């Protein structure tokens, strides 16, 4: 995360780290959506132009974490994967359309002060909250600039109107994406970056005071560049698929 700050303890208890077994290293961010399901970006798992195709046995999820590198004894929980589910129309060939995947845990994780699931939006909350100017929050242990942080980082960012999103890039943008970030002249700045992939963009509903995950960190050209914006998978748009997968697995 660029130009964010250190997270508070327990501030993002749904934050998950995708972790490589060998060599042991951070791979991506992710989120806890129930005691046995984790949500992440498909490109965290499958990206053939980079010869990336991870399978369950390559990976672990670490839940309840604050520090990036430390093993947080008596606090984090580490979980093995039962099954990875990738959107079948995930478009890695062109623009990362439908950049979303689910991971089912071998065994359920125990909730705690540091481990708790995020809500997924209903159509009304989404319609309510996904407006230009409305700020969400993104969290991650990724790059601090275009080194790496000691603890989880947090940054709040405004949703950007779709024509400005579209006009900032040569990529073909879809309804399954949204973009977020300050405009060059808006003064403030901040962005997700390499390593933040698959982590959540969340919003706090003013109607019932719960946190909802509206987005997944997906792509961007550079990090925190003027006139460029971070792009996020639109979780509500793909909820149908989400519900199917969980409903039948």
């Amino acid at each position: 995360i660029v130009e964010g700050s250190d997270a508070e303890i327990g501030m993002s208890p749904w934050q998950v780290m995708l972790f490589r077994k060998s060599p042991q290293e951070l791979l991506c961010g992710a989120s806890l959506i129930s005691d046995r399901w984790v949500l992440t970006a498909a490109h965290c798992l499958l990206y053939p132009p980079w010869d990336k195709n991870f399978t369950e046995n390559d990976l672990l999820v670490r839940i309840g974490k604050h520090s990036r590198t430390r093993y947080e004894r008596n606090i984090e929980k580490i979980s093995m994967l039962e099954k990875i589910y990738i959107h079948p129309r995930y478009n890695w060939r062109e623009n990362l359309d439908r950049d979303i995947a689910l991971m089912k845990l071998k065994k359920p994780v125990a909730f705690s002060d540091y481990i708790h699931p995020v809500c997924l939006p209903d159509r009304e909350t989404a319609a309510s909250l996904l407006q230009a100017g409305y700020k969400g929050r993104v969290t991650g242990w990724g790059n601090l600039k275009e080194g790496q942080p000691s603890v989880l980082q947090v940054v709040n960012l405004p949703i950007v109107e779709r024509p400005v999103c579209k006009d900032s890039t040569r990529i073909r943008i879809t309804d399954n994406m949204f973009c977020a970030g300050y405009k060059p002249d808006e003064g403030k700045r901040g962005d997700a970056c390499e390593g933040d992939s698959g982590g959540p963009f969340v919003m706090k509903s003013p109607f019932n005071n719960r946190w909802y995950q509206m987005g997944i960190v997906s792509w961007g050209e550079g990090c925190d560049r003027d006139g460029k914006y971070g792009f996020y998978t639109h979780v509500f748009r793909l909820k149908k698929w989400i519900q199917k997968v969980i409903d039948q697995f």
């Binding site: 042991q24 290293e25 590198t69 093993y71």
Partner: peptide, 11 residues
Amino acid sequence: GDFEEIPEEYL
């Protein structure tokens, strides 16, 4: 790189 070793039990 710089990661603290995790319990071998999780691997």
